[PDB]
């Protein structure tokens, strides 16, 4: 339930920028939101994604906002995309 995501910035580094512990009903929304005071960039502008260890280089869309992590499948130890 608690997920532990490692975060990346691909359009800036191609390492892994921090870690973040998020509920599995953590809406993509909130996600942006959180990101967004994170990065000072706005909501609306952010484009997320994710990599599963499993499958690397794949990445898995996280569109519609008002969907929940666990919802698109995203598991513990996953990579969040984070783009603007």
């Keep these: 339930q608690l997920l532990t995501l490692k975060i990346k ?3 800036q580094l191609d ?3 921090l870690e ?3 509920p599995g009903s953590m ?3 909130k996600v942006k939101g ?9 909501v609306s502008d952010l484009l997320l994604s994710y990599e599963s260890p499993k499958k690397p280089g ?5 569109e519609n906002d008002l969907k929940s ?3 698109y499948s995203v598991e ?3 990579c969040l995309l984070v783009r603007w």
Excluded: A, C, W
């Design 76 to 78: 513990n130890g996953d």
């Design 69 to 71: 992590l666990q919802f």
């Design 27 to 29: 809406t993509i929304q």
């Design 34 to 42: 959180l990101l967004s005071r994170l990065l000072k960039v706005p």
């Design 58 to 62: 794949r990445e898995i869309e996280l």
């Design 20 to 22: 973040k512990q998020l």
């Design 9 to 11: 910035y691909p359009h």
């Design 15 to 17: 390492q892994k920028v």
